[PDB]
Every structure is written in structure tokens, then in C-alpha cells.
């Protein structure tokens, strides 16, 4: 009755994988990136907008800056497919042979950029100035405003310098586009573009070129912040110039003296040398942080006359105790305040704080002069904790925050805020708060209480509500139009499997209006004028397409402006030759909880049959595997698995994202113990609904959390899973960083019971005695989850005698990048199932 997979040779498997990748259907390899819309005067030509973005038009394997003219009065019956015009004439932006310096390659690994060339850029609208980093250094060009829009590509101008290392993180000053800033050799620098002069404002890094001896850093994000909170900057420009022209820059200075150091092999294997990282493991000490200003004054010709740098009149750690992280920070649009978001250590109390620039005084070591600065501060200057969010599960960190430029109402301060711990779901709120003052005496030090600078709420109006949530992470934002009192956002109001665009009046919280067509998942970006928007969407059965829409309608009622399809920038492909799109389903558990999923039913199926199955699994938080998007290019190996006769079952059990807090809050302090029961419950269900599932031959397979879950299944459910192929697993939980483990697992001092039963390396005696029931894969250069985790597991297997197999990827970090390591990963994957399942 059963069905036995065909046996192939090793070269045969290599050939079928090479063929399945050749038949991919000529993917674009990149969709148009972040856009910018620039209006044009109508008398200048037939077009009305110019649209700038990033992409690779299949020509080169190099992401590049492109633009397109948005026509005027396009005719309806015929589809218009906009061009992709080059903007930099024959300028390659990847380094020679595609090898990056260690700083920028580590940053690319932190951002997961798998493309070469210009990855991001900074753009000043008024001057129309483009500034970016390409090859090994900074470049800039001008197309927008006074220069007049271009027709032919033009040459980018290299910014000459005298620094040694690489110039990181360029940022154009909004108040004046003649200057910019950057990070060099772990310190901060400000430079001019016209006069070519530079200046250094921070003196923290010795430059001794040894991570061990120079721990301090200024205006740069540490590791745990980059990885587990997704903030890739440490400096921020003040958007207004104060009156000589004075400019401000808020930045942070980190002190990593007491952070534990570890060694990681380097991409140069022959040297047999390692690189050291400040890696704070769970329970250890995080670095010391602080916030500092850095003024600088210029004259009419653009010369930096003075350049000071100030600090809080009290030690940062004194005004704000129980503060472990700086999630986000920035200014308001008038320049009257600088704000930041503080997280405590258990990650259960986030709070917005508002800081006036007047609280920053120059660094005066002479105690006599310092007591003069602490005397000259105005009375109404003090920190303002506008908002505080306390939960019982954990605080997910949002970027969504939009303060309104206040008129001469000295008491009030109104802003939107996507709060999530109030109802259990991420919803927008319009909150107005009165900035109460106390007229502190900064000369005498103060030990702040729990409610020192907390200002009382005047109103708190929910704008959205229901059993759904507003997209707030992974680069999702909101667009607020203050001429019509609206707010555009993205959420899952329709169904948890789709991302749609919405709009609602933030003055009167009326009815929400969807702006995208149902049946797809949309990733869209508005215009700054709120008349056009581009949407990138797809579905399970359709590859992505990128259309541009134009909001038309009567000007008196702006809420109901109808979205008109204007033009297209990319069409679907449908991947016809060998791709059967999976089928989404959903079931209930015995605890009455709805879960979703998908199944790749085997090709060439026959009734009264049974196929070997492969329960693909990630299971970890902040990841949703089942949604109505095109999985055809991301996970196509699962289609190849199905093409041979395997039945792939994906299931997003309790713990995943996009379903609220109380749903995700099932992992708290029980990580590992609960996610498998949802996988086996959702695997036995498919045995009822469908009949081709052979529960005798059940595999399991994951990566970096599913690798951890692959091992937990084989321990807890040895009779359900025959084999188990773990990938870059997390074996011991006491050797992972603070930003992630403490969020969910509550440092071992408190959860030593759960750390024991969650670490899979401490239960090695329950693994199978029989051979050929465990494969292990890990990358050698991995710095996210180090090779130690696999290395310590193998050590525990030998102390008990259990068999295993192992595959190491020497030139691969946490993500398989080169194709030869990708092919060899899949070729060896099929071969294990072919023989031992």
C-alpha cells in the first residue's frame, strides 16, 4: 500500500537539483526597493513625478540606483510598463571581486542583505542630493532641484578624504545639505561636501587597532542592539539650525569594558587566526551607554568655527536607573526636543522620554565651572517621560511614533503611538499629554523616584481595534497626512494571512478603509504628497508584481479617495513548469486554538497510498511561515521534496507572530517544551483530512530554531519522528546573548528549571541509540549561533555513546551564501531521506 521513493545516485541528485534551479523561471533576483517621489513643474514636460529607487534589472548582479518618470493621463485600455532608467553611467558599486571589509560585511550579515552593490542611500529632497557608499568609499550626486532633472546617466563624484578605515553610515544634515556626518574607526566625524573639509567630534576610540584595549565607542550600535533590536545607527541630526549657524547631533557613547569577549574564526582560513567580539551572554553584563550632544558652529562660507560636545548635567545612569537598552532615538520636527526609547533589563517596561537640548552642558572637569552650567539652565528644562508601556509577557519594540509639531500651546504634546500591551494587539492610539514641569535644582544631585518625570495623560483615543494588529516591525511604518487629518498604515484586519493598506482619520476615529485588493499580501510605500503609492504584492499561487496607484477623488472628502491603478513596474511569472503552489489549511486543537498551515501534496499521487513526510519547522517567535505570499522562490526546495514524492507539512504553532501577544506569549519560560505538541497535533490532523500521509516514515527538519526544534521532537516524540535533520541548532541556552534569551527565558537565575529542560544538549541520553537517525549541520564562521553549540552537543553525544552524523560548512556564517554550499546542502539533504527514511 505504501510508496517508496526512487533511489538516485549522488550525481543524479546533483543533476536534479541543478535542473530544478535552472527551471526557476528567470527570477528578477530583486524587486524595486525603497522609493522616493519628487514632483515636477508641469511646464517642464509631459510627466508629473520622478520616482527614485534601487534595483537590479537582471542586467548585472549589482543593485543600483534607478528612476522612472510617472506619466500624465495614461490611457486605461492598455497596460503601461514603466522603464528602469539608470542614473549612474557605468559605475560598479561592488568592491573588487565582491569582497567587503569586515565592518560592512558584518553589517550586511546583520541586515541579511544578499545582494551586491548600493544597498541603501540617503537623499535630501530640497537640494535633491544623493549620498551613499559604493565600492570602498562615499559618493554623491545631484539630480532633484536646482540642477534640473536629468535625461542621461551622470557620473558620481567620489568624496575625497584623509581618514584610514571605511566611512560608515553617512547622514545628510536636514537643516543644511552642505554638510554630512559619518562613522570612521569607531568614532564620529562631520564633513563638508563643497569645501571638502572634515572634522572629528568624538575621541573615544584609541585606534590601537585591538578590540581588547580600546573598549569605548561613540555613535555606533553594538552587537546585541544590531541583532536583537534592529537599530543600525547611533547618531541623529537635529533637523533645524539654531542661531553663526549652530547644528546639533544626538549620539550615544557605549562602554564595552566589562562585556565578555569570545573568539570567532575569520574568513581567511589559512591564517588560522580569530576575531574577537564583545558578546554578552545571558546573565552577563551589557555595555554601559549614555546620550550626548555634539554642537558645531559655522559661518556664511561653511567653515566649522567651533565644535563642542556636551553631556547631561547628571550621569545618564543616575537620572535613569533600570535602563539597559536604547531601542530608538530621534528629534521632533521643530528641533525643540530630542527623544529616546528606554528598555529595562527584563524587557517589560518600555518608555518614551523627551529631552530638551538645554539639559546638555559642556564637559567641564573644573568643578567650579560645572556648577555654573548647572546654574544657567532655564527653569522649564527637564526630561519628559511622555509614555510608558508595562506588560506581563514582554515588550516588542516598535518604530511607529509621530509627534505633532505643537503650536504655542506650552502645556500640550500630541502624538500617535502604536501601543500593543494595552489590548493584546498592536493598535494605533492618539494620545495627548501635558508636559508638567517641576523646575529642578540641577546643582544638587537628585535620586529620581519611579514617577519623577512621568507626565499625566490628558486623553488616549484608540483609532483601530479588533482581533487583529497593525504592522509595526521589520521595517513597517505609517504615513501621516496633516493636511487632511489621516494616517496610512498596514495591518491584518482582513485575515492573518495578508498584509493590507489602510487609512483612518486620526482626528475622528471613524471607519477604516482598505486601499488594496483582497486575496494578496501587500508591502507598499506611500508618497510624501499623498497622491500616489507603490505596492508590492503576491499570493501563494502568483509571483510578485509591483504596481503604482494614484489616489483620485473629490478633494472635499479625502478619506474615500479611490485608488486608481496607474502603471506597473514588474509583472508576475506564474512559474508554470514544475511548481505546484501549496494549499493553506487550518484546524483547531484540543485547547480550542486555531492554527494555520500548508501542505505540499506529493506530485503524481494515487489513491490508497502513503508517502513519507517531512515536517518542515521553524516554530520560533517573530517568524510567521504560513501566509498568503509566494513561497516559490524562498522555499523551493520544499517543492523539490514534493516533486520526488515527499509530503511537506508546514505549521505555525503557538509562538509565531502576526496573531497577537497572548498567542505568542505561550513560550514564556517554557521555550522548547510546548512548540512540538502543536507540530505533532497538526501532523496527526493531516492524517485525517488527507490520506496520503505515511505516519510510519516521518522526518523533521529546521534551521537555527527548527534545528533546535528538530532535536526536541526526536527527544520528546521518538516514536513519531524517525530521522531528524537539525541545522545550526541552539543546543544550550546559557550560551546565547542577552537581547533574545532574557526576553523569552528570564535569565537562568530565575528560570533554572526551564533552562534545564530547554537545553537539548543536557538530555543527550534520550536521543536514539540506533544509527542513521540524526544529522547535524552548522557553519564554522557563524557568529549568530556559534559553532560551539554543535561542538558542545557532539561532546555530550560521546559521553553517552549515541551515534550521529555531521556536516560542517567552513566558509559559511549563519546563512548559506555561496552556491556550492547551497547545492551541497540540498544534495546531501535528499540523500539522507532517500536512504534512512
Amino acid at each position: 500500500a505504501r510508496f517508496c521513493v526512487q533511489k538516485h545516485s549522488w550525481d543524479g541528485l546533483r543533476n536534479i537539483i541543478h535542473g530544478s534551479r535552472k527551471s526557476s523561471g528567470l527570477i528578477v533576483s530583486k524587486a524595486p526597493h525603497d522609493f522616493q517621489f519628487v514632483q515636477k513643474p508641469d511646464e517642464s514636460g509631459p510627466h508629473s513625478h520622478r520616482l527614485y529607487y534601487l534595483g537590479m534589472p537582471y542586467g548585472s548582479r549589482e543593485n543600483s540606483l534607478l528612476y522612472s518618470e510617472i506619466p500624465k493621463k495614461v490611457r486605461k485600455e492598455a497596460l503601461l510598463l514603466l522603464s528602469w532608467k539608470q542614473m549612474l553611467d557605468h559605475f560598479q558599486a561592488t568592491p573588487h571581486h565582491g569582497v567587503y571589509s569586515r565592518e560592512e560585511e558584518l553589517l550586511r550579515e546583520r541586515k541579511r542583505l544578499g545582494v551586491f552593490g548600493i544597498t541603501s542611500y540617503d537623499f535630501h529632497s530640497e537640494s535633491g542630493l544623493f549620498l551613499f557608499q559604493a565600492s570602498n568609499s562615499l559618493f554623491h550626486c545631484r539630480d532633484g532641484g536646482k540642477n534640473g532633472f536629468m535625461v542621461s546617466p551622470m557620473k558620481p563624484l567620489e568624496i575625497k578624504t584623509q581618514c584610514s578605515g571605511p566611512r560608515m553610515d553617512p547622514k545628510i544634515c536636514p537643516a543644511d545639505p552642505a554638510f554630512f556626518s559619518f562613522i570612521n574607526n569607531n568614532d564620529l566625524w562631520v564633513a563638508n561636501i563643497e569645501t571638502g573639509e572634515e572634522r572629528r567630534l568624538t575621541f573615544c576610540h584609541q585606534g590601537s587597532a585591538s578590540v581588547l584595549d580600546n573598549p569605548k565607542s561613540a555613535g555606533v550600535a553594538t552587537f546585541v542592539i544590531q541583532e536583537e533590536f534592529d537599530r543600525f545607527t547611533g547618531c541623529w541630526w537635529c533637523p533645524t539650525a539654531s542661531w553663526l549657524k549652530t547644528l546639533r547631533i544626538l549620539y550615544e557613547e557605549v562602554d564595552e569594558s566589562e562585556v565578555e569577549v569570545i573568539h570567532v574564526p575569520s574568513p581567511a582560513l589559512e591564517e588560522r587566526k580569530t576575531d574577537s567580539y564583545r558578546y554578552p551572554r545571558t546573565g552577563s553584563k551589557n555595555p554601559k551607554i549614555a546620550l550626548k550632544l555634539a554642537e558645531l558652529q559655522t559661518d556664511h562660507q561653511g567653515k566649522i568655527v567651533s565644535s563642542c560636545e556636551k553631556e547631561l548635567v547628571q550621569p545618564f545612569s543616575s537620572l535613569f536607573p533600570k535602563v539597559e537598552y536604547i531601542a530608538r532615538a530621534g528629534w521632533t520636527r521643530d528641533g525643540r526636543y530630542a527623544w529616546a526609547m528606554f528598555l529595562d533589563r527584563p524587557q517589560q517596561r518600555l518608555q518614551l522620554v523627551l529631552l530638551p537640548p538645554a539639559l546638555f552642558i559642556p564637559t567641564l572637569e573644573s568643578e567650579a565651572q560645572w556648577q555654573e552650567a548647572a546654574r544657567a539652565i532655564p527653569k522649564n528644562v527637564q526630561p519628559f517621560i511622555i509614555y510608558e508601556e508595562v506588560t506581563n509577557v514582554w515588550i516588542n519594540v516598535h518604530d511607529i511614533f509621530h509627534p505633532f509639531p505643537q503650536a504655542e500651546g506650552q502645556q500640550d504634546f500630541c502624538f500617535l503611538r502604536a501601543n500593543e500591551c494595552k489590548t493584546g494587539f498592536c493598535h494605533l492610539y492618539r494620545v495627548t499629554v501635558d508636559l508638567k514641569t517641576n523646575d529642578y535644582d540641577w546643582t544638587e544631585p537628585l535620586s529620581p523616584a519611579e514617577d519623577e518625570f512621568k507626565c499625566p495623560i490628558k486623553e488616549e483615543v484608540a483609532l483601530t481595534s479588533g482581533e487583529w494588529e497593525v504592522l509595526s516591525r521589520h521595517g513597517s511604518k505609517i504615513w501621516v497626512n496633516e493636511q487632511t487629518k489621516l494616517v496610512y498604515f498596514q495591518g491584518t484586519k482582513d485575515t492573518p494571512l495578508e498584509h493590507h493598506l489602510y487609512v483612518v482619520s486620526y482626528e475622528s476615529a471613524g471607519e477604516i478603509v482598505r486601499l488594496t485588493t483582497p486575496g494578496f499580501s501587500h508591502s507598499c510605500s506611500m508618497s510624501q504628497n499623498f497622491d500616489m503609492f507603490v505596492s508590492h504584492y503576491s499570493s501563494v499561487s502568483t509571483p510578485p508584481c509591483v504596481h503604482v496607484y494614484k489616489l483620485s477623488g473629490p478633494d472635499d472628502d479625502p478619506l474615500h479617495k479611490q485608488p486608481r491603478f496607474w502603471a506597473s513596474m514588474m509583472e508576475a511569472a506564474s512559474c508554470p513548469p514544475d511548481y505546484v503552489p501549496p494549499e493553506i489549511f487550518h484546524f483547531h486543537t484540543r485547547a480550542d486554538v486555531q492554527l494555520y498551515g500548508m501542505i505540499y501534496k506529493p506530485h503524481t499521487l494515487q489513491p490508497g497510498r502513503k508517502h513519507p513526510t517531512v515536517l518542515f519547522v521553524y516554530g520560533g517567535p517573530q517568524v510567521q511561515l504560513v501566509n498568503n505570499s509566494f513561497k516559490g522562490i524562498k522555499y523551493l526546495r520544499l517543492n523539490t521534496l514534493a516533486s520526488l514524492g515527499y509530503a511537506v507539512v508546514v505549521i505555525d504553532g503557538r509562538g509565531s507572530c502576526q496573531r497577537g501577544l497572548h498567542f505568542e506569549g505561550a513560550l514564556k519560560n517554557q521555550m522548547g517544551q510546548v512548540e512540538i505538541e502543536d507540530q505533532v497535533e497538526g501532523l496527526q490532523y493531516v492524517a485525517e483530512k488527507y490520506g496520503f500521509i505515511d505516519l510510519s516514515r516521518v522526518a523533521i527538519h529546521g534551521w537555527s530554531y527548527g534545528g533546535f526544534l528538530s532535536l526536541m521532537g526526536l527527544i520528546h516524540k521518538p516514536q513519531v519522528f524517525k530521522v531528524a535533520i537539525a541545522g545550526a541548532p541552539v543546543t544550550v541556552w546559557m550560551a546565547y546573548d542577552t537581547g533574545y534569551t532574557e526576553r523569552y527565558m528570564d535569565v537562568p537565575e530565575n528560570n533554572q528549571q526551564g533552562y534545564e529542560a530547554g537545553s537539548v544538549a543536557l538530555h543527550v541520553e534520550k536521543l536514539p541509540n540506533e544509527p542513521n537517525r540524526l544529522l547535524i549541520l552548522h557553519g564554522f564562521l557563524d557568529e549568530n549561533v556559534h559553532f560551539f553549540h554543535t561542538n558542545f552537543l557532539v561532546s555530550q553525544l560521546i559521553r553517552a555513546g549515541k551515534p550521529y552524523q555531521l556536516q560542517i560548512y567552513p566558509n559559511e556564517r549563519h546563512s548559506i551564501r555561496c552556491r556550492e554550499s547551497g547545492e551541497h546542502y540540498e544534495v546531501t539533504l535528499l540523500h539522507f531521506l532517500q536512504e534512512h527514511l
Binding site: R21, K22, R112, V623, G822, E826
Partner: protein, 134 residues
């Protein structure tokens, strides 16, 4: 935490250009392995024409090769290859253009010329050069 992304790579088309020069009876061949494009042929044609070299049309590889592969140039023993390997990779047009030269005294009954995959020993190309092309 995000699931690691396995890279996607597609092979590309390519052509192989054969050039020759005859001095008295000795032949110097110039073999070019280059991704199939337009500008590169009408550039390399002039670059070789400067040294009085000329082209000889022979079919390109049918299979789609990957960018970054190495290929052994093989023949019958009567040839002399100063570079024994060729490499398929994009090249800036205004910059230098790599090739492999071959020295043979007298062709006579025609000489074989083969490219062979370094990693798997695949015969992905061939050419039976004859004096008729000269």
C-alpha cells in the same frame, strides 16, 4: 531571529571565440571564453584586428555555464598552451580582455581543441580546427 536564506544562482549563456594568425606556417590561436553579449564581440574584434589576428566561427557551448567556473584547455599533445586554464567571468569592456594563446607549428590533418570542466571533468565544448578555416 530570521530563517537563513539559501542563495539563488542561475547559469548564464556564453560564447567561445577563436582567433588566429599565420606568420609563415606556424599558427598562433587566441581562444576567448566570454559571456554572450553584443559589445564584447565588436570590441574584441578590433582588439585582435590591431595585431592582424582574425576570427573563425565555431559553435558556442549549448549548456548554460555558471559564472565563476574554471575550464582546462586540452588538446592532442602537439599544441603549446601558455595559459592552460580559462575562466568565465564578467569583464569591464574598457579594461583588459583575458584569453589563452596556443602555438602550433603545422596543423596538417587538423587539431582538436577542448574545454573541460575543472570540478566534474565535463566536456562542455570542442572544436576540430582545420586549415580550411585559415
Amino acid at each position: 531571529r530570521m530563517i537563513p536564506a539559501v542563495g539563488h544562482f542561475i547559469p548564464i549563456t556564453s560564447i567561445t571565440l577563436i582567433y588566429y594568425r599565420l606568420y609563415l606556417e606556424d599558427i598562433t590561436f587566441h581562444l576567448y571564453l566570454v559571456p554572450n553579449d553584443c559589445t564584447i564581440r565588436k570590441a574584441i574584434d578590433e582588439e585582435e584586428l590591431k595585431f592582424q589576428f582574425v576570427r573563425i566561427n565555431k559553435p558556442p557551448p549549448v549548456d548554460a555555464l555558471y559564472v565563476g567556473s574554471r575550464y582546462i584547455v586540452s588538446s592532442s599533445k602537439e599544441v603549446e598552451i601558455l595559459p592552460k586554464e580559462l575562466e568565465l567571468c564578467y569583464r569591464s569592456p574598457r579594461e583588459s580582455q583575458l584569453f589563452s594563446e596556443i602555438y602550433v607549428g603545422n596543423i596538417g590533418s587538423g587539431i582538436n581543441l577542448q574545454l573541460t570542466d575543472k570540478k566534474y571533468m565535463n566536456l562542455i565544448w570542442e572544436a576540430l580546427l582545420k586549415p580550411g578555416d585559415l
